[PDB]
Amino acid sequence: GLPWGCPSDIPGWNTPWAC
């Protein structure tokens, strides 16, 4: 859900955890 990181968090934004 964040405006940083890699695609994608569950809302479809990004998260570092997706990297």
Rounded Cα distance between 10 and 8, Å, is 7
Task: Please report, as a single letter, which amino acid is at residue 5.
Answer: G
CB atoms closer than 10 angstroms to residue 1? 11
Q: How was this structure determined?
A: X-ray
Rounded Cα distance between 11 and 8, Å, is 8
Rounded Cα distance between 13 and 17, Å, is 12
Contact 14, 5 (CB under 8 A): yes
Rounded Cα distance between 3 and 11, Å, is 11
Rounded Cα distance between 17 and 2, Å, is 10
Task: Please report, as a single letter, which amino acid is at residue 1.
Answer: G
Task: Please report, as a single letter, which amino acid is at residue 19.
Answer: C
Resolution as reported, in Å: 0.9
Contact 19, 8 (CB under 8 A): no
